PDB file of N, CA, C and O (backbone and C1' of nucleotides) and ligand atoms in Angstrom:
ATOM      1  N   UNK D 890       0.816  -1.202   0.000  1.00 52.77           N
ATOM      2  CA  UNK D 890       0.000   0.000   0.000  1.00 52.77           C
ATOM      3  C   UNK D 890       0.854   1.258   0.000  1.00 52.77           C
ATOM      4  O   UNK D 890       0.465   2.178  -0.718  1.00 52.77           O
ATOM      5  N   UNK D 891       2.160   1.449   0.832  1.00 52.10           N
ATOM      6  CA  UNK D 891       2.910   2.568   0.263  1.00 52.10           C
ATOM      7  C   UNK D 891       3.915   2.643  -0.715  1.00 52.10           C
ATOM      8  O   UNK D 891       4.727   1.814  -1.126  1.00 52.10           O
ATOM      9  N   UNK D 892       3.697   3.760  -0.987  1.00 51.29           N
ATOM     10  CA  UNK D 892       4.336   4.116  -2.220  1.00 51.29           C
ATOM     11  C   UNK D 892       5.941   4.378  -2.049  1.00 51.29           C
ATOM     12  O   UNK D 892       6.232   5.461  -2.557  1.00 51.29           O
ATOM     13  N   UNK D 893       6.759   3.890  -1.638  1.00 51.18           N
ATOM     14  CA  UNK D 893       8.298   4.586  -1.697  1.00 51.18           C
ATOM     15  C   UNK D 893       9.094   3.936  -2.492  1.00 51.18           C
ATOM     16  O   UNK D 893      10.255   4.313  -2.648  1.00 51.18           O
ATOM     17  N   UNK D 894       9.896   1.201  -4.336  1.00 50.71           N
ATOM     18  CA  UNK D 894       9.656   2.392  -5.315  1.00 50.71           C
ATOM     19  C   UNK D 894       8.253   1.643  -5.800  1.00 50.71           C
ATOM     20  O   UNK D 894       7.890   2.204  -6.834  1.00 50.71           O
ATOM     21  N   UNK D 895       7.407   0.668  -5.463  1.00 49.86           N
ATOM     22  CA  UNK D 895       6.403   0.299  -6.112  1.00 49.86           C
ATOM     23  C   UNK D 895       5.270   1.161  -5.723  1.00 49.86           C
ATOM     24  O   UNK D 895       5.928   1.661  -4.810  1.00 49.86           O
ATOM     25  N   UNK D 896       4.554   1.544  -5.662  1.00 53.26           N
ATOM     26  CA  UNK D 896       3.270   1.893  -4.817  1.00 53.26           C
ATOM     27  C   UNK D 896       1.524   1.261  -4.694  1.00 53.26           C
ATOM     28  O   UNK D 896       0.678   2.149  -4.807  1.00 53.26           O
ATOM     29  N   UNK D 897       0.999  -0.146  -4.481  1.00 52.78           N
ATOM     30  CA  UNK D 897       0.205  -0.786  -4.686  1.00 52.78           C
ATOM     31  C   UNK D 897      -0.237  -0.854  -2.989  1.00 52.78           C
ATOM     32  O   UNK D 897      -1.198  -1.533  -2.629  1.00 52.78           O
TER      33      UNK D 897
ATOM     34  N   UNK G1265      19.668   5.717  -4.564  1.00 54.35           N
ATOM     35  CA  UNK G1265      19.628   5.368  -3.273  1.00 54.35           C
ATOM     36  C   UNK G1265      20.859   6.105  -2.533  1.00 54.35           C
ATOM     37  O   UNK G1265      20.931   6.724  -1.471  1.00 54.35           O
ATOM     38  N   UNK G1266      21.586   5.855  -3.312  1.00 54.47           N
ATOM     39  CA  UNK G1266      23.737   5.985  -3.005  1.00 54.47           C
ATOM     40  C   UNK G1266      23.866   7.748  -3.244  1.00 54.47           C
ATOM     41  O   UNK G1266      23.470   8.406  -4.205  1.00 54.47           O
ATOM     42  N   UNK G1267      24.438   8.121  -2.227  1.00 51.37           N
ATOM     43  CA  UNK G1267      24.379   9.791  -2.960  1.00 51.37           C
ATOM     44  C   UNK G1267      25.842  10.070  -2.424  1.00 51.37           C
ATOM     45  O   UNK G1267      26.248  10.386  -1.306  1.00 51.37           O
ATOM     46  N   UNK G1268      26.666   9.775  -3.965  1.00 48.54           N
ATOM     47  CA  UNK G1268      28.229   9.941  -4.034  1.00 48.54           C
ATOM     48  C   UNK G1268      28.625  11.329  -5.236  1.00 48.54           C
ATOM     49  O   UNK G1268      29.795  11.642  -5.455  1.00 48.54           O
ATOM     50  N   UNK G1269      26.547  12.145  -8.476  1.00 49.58           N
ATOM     51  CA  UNK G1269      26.634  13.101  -7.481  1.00 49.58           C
ATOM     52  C   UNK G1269      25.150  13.428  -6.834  1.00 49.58           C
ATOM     53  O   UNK G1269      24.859  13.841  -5.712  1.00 49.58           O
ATOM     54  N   UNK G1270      24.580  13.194  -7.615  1.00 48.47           N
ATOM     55  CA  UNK G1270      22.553  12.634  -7.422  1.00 48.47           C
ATOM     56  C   UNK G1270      22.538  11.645  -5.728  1.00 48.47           C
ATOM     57  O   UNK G1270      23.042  10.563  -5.428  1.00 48.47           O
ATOM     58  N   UNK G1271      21.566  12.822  -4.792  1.00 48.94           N
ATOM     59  CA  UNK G1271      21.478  11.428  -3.949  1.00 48.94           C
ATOM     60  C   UNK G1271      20.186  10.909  -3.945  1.00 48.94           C
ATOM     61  O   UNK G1271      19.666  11.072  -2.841  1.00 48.94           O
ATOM     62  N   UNK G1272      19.358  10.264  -4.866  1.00 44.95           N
ATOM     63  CA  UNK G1272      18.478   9.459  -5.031  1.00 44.95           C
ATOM     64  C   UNK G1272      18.263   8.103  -4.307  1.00 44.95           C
ATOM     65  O   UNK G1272      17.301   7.393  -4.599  1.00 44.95           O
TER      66      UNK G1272
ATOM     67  O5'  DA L 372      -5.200  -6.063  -5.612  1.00 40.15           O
ATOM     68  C5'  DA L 372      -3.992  -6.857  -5.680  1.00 40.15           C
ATOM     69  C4'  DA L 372      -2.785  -6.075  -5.234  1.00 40.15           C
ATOM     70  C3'  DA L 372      -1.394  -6.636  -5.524  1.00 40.15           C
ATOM     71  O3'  DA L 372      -0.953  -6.153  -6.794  1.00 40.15           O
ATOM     72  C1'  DA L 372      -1.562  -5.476  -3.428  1.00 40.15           C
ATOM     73  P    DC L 373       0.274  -6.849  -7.587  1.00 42.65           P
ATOM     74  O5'  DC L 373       1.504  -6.209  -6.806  1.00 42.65           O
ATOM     75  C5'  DC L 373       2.845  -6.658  -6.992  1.00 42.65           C
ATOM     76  C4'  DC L 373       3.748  -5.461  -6.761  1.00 42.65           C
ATOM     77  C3'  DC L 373       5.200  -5.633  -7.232  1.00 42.65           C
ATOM     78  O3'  DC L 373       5.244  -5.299  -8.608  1.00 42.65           O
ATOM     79  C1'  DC L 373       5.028  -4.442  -5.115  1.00 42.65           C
ATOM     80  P    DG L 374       6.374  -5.639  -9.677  1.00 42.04           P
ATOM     81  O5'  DG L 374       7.008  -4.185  -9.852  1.00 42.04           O
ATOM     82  C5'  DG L 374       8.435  -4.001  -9.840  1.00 42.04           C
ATOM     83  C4'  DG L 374       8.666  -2.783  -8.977  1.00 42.04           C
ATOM     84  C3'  DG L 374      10.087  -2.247  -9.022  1.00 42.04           C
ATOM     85  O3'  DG L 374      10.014  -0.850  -9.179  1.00 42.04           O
ATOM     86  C1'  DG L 374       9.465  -2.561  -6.809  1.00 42.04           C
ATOM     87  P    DT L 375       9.900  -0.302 -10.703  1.00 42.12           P
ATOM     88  O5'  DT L 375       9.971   1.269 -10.464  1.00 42.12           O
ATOM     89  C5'  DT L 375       8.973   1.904  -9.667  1.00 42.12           C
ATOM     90  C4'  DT L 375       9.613   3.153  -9.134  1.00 42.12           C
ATOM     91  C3'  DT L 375      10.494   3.870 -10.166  1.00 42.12           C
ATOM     92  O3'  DT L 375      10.108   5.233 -10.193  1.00 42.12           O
ATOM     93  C1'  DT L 375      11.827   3.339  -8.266  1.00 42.12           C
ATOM     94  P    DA L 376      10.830   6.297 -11.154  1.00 44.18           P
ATOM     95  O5'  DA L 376      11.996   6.866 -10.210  1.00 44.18           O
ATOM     96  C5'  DA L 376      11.686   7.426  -8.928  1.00 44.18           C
ATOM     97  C4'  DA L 376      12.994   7.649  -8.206  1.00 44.18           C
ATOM     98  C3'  DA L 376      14.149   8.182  -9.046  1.00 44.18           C
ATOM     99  O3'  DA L 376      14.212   9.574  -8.777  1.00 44.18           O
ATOM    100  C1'  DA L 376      14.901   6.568  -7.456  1.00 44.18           C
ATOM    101  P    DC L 377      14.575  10.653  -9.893  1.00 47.92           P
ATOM    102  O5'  DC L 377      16.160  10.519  -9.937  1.00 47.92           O
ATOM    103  C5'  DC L 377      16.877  11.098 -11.063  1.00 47.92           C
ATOM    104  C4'  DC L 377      18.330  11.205 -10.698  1.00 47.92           C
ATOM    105  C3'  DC L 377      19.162  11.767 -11.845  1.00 47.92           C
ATOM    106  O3'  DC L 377      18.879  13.151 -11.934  1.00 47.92           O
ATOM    107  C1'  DC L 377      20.382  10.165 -10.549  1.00 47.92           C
ATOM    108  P    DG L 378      19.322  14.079 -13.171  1.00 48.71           P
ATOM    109  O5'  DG L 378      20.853  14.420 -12.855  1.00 48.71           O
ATOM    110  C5'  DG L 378      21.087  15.478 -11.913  1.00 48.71           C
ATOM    111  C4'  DG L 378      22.444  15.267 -11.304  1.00 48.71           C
ATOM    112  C3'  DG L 378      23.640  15.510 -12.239  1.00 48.71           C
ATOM    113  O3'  DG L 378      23.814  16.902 -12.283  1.00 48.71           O
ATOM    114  C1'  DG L 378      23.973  13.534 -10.922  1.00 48.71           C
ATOM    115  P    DT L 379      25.054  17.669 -12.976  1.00 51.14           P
ATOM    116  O5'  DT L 379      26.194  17.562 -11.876  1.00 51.14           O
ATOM    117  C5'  DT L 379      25.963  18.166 -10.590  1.00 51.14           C
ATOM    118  C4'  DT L 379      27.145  17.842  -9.721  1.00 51.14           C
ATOM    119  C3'  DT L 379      28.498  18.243 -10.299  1.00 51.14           C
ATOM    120  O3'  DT L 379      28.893  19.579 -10.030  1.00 51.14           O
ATOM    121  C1'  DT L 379      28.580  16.022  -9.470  1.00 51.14           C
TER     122       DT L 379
ATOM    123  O5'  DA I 338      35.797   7.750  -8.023  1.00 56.38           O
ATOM    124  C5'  DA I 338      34.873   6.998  -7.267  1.00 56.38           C
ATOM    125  C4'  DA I 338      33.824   7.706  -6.443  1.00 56.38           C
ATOM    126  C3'  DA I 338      32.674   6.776  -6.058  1.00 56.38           C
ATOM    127  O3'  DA I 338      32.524   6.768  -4.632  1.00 56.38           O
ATOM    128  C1'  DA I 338      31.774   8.683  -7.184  1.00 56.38           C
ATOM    129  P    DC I 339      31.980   5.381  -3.983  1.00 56.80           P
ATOM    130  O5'  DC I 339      30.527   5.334  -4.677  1.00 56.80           O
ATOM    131  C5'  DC I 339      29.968   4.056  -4.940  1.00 56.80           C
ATOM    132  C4'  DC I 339      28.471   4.135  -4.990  1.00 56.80           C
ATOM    133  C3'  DC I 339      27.735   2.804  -5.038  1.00 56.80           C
ATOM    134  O3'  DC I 339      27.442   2.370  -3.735  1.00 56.80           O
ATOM    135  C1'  DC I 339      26.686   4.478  -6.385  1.00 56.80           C
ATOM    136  P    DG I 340      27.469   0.796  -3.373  1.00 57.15           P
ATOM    137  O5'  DG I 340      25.990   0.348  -3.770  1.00 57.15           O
ATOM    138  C5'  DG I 340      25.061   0.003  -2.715  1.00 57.15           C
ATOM    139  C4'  DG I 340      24.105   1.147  -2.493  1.00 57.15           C
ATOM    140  C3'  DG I 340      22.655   0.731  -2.355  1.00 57.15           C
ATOM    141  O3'  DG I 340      21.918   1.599  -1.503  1.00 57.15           O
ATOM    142  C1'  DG I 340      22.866   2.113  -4.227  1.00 57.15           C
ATOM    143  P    DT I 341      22.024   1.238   0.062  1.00 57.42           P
ATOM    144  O5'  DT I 341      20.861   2.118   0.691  1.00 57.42           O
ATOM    145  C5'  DT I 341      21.033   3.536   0.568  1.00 57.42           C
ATOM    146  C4'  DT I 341      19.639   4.105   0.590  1.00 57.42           C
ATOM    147  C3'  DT I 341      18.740   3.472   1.650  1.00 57.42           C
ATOM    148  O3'  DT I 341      18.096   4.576   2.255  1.00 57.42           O
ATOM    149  C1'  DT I 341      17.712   3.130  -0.436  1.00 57.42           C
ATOM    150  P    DA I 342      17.191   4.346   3.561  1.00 57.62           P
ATOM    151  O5'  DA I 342      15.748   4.268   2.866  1.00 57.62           O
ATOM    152  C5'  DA I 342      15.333   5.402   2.088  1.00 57.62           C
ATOM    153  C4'  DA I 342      14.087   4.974   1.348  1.00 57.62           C
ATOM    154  C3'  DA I 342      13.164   4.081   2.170  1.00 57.62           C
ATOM    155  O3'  DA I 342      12.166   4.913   2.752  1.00 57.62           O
ATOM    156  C1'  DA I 342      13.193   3.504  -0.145  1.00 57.62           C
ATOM    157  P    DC I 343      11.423   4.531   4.118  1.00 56.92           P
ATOM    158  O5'  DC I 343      10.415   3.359   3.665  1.00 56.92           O
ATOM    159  C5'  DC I 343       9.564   2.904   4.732  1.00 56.92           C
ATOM    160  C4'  DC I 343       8.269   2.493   4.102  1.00 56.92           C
ATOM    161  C3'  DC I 343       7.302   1.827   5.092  1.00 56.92           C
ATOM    162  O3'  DC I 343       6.642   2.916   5.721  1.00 56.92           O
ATOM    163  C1'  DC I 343       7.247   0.770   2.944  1.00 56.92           C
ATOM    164  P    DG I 344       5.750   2.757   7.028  1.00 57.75           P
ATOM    165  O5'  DG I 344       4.298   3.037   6.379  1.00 57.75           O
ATOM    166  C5'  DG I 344       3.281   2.107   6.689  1.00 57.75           C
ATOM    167  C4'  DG I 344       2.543   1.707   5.438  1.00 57.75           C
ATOM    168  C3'  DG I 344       1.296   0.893   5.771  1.00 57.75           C
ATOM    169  O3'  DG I 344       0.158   1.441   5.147  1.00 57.75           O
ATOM    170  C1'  DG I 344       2.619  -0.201   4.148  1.00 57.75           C
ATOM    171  P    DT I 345      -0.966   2.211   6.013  1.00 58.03           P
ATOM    172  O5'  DT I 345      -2.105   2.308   4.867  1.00 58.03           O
ATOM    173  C5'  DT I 345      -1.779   2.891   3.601  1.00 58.03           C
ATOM    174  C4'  DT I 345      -2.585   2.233   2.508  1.00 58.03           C
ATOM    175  C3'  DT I 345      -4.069   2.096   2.837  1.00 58.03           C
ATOM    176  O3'  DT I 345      -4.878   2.454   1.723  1.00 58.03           O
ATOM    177  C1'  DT I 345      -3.157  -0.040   2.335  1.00 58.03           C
TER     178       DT I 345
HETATM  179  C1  QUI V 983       0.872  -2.021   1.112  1.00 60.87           C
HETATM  180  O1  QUI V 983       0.569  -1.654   2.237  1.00 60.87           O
HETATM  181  C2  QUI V 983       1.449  -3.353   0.813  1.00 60.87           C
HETATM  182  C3  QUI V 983       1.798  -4.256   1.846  1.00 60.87           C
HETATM  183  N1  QUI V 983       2.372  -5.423   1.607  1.00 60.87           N
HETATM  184  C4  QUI V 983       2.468  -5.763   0.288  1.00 60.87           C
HETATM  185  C5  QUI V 983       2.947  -7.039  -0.086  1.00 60.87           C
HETATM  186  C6  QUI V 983       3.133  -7.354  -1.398  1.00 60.87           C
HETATM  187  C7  QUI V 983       2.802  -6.423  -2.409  1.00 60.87           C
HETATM  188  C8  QUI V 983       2.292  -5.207  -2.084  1.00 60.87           C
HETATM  189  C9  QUI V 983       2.172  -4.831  -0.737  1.00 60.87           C
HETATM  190  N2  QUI V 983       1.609  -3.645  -0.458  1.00 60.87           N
HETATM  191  C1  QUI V 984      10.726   0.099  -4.373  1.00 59.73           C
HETATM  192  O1  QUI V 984      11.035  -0.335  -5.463  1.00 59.73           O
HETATM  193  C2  QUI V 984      11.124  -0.524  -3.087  1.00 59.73           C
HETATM  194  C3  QUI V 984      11.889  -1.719  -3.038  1.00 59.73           C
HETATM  195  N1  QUI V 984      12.296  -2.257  -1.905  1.00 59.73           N
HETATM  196  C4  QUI V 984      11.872  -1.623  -0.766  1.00 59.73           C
HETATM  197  C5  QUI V 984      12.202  -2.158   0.506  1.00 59.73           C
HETATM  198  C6  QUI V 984      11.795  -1.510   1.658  1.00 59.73           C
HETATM  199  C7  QUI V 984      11.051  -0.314   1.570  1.00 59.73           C
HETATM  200  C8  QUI V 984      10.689   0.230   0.369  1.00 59.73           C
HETATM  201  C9  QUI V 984      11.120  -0.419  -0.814  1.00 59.73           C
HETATM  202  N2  QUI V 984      10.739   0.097  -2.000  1.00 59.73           N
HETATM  203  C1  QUI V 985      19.637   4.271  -5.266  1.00 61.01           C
HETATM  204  O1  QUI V 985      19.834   3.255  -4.628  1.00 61.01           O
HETATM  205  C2  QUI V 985      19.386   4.266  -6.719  1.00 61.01           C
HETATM  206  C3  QUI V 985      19.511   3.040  -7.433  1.00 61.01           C
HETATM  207  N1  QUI V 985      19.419   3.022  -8.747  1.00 61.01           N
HETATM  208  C4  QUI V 985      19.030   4.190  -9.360  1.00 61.01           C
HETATM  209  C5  QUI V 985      18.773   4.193 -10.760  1.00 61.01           C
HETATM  210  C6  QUI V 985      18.475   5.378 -11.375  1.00 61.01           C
HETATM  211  C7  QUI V 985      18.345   6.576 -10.615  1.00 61.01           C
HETATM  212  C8  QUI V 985      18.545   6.599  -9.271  1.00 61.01           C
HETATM  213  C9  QUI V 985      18.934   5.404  -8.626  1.00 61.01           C
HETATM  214  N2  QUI V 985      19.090   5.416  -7.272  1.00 61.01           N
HETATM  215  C1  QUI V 986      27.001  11.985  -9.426  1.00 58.90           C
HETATM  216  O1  QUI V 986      26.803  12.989 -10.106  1.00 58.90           O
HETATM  217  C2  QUI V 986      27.394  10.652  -9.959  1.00 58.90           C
HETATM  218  C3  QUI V 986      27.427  10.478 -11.356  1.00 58.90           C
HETATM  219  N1  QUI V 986      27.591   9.323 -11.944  1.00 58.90           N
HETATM  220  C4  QUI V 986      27.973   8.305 -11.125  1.00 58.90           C
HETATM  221  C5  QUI V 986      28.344   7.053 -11.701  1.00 58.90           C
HETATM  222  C6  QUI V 986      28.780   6.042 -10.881  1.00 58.90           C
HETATM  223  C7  QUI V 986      28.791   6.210  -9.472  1.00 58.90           C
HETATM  224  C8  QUI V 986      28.440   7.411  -8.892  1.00 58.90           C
HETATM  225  C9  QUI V 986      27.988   8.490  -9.711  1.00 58.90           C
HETATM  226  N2  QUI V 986      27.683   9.683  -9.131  1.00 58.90           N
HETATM  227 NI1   NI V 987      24.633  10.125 -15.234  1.00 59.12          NI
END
DNA sequence: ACGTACGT
DNA sequence: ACGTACGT
């Protein structure tokens, strides 16, 4: 759920 | 990630 | 419900 | 001259 490098 | 000259 | 991010 | 960065 966060984004920092995928963000889903 | 590495910031040696961009620190990304 | 998954990998992105740069230039001296 | 070089890899770090999380939860909905
Ligand atoms: C987001 O909160 C989150 C948490 N765990 C995960 C596991 C696998 C893929 C995506 C994920 N996203
Ligand atoms: C993004 O591509 C990515 C990959 N690995 C991680 C590990 C821990 C936190 C965030 C991350 N983000
Ligand atoms: C940092 O760890 C890192 C890794 N690879 C990259 C590729 C392109 C731009 C920035 C980057 N940063
Ligand atoms: C910073 O500007 C910079 C430029 N290119 C690089 C290539 C390899 C390692 C570190 C680098 N840093
Ligand atoms: Ni470059």
């Amino acid at each position: 759920x966060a984004x920092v490098x995928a963000x889903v």
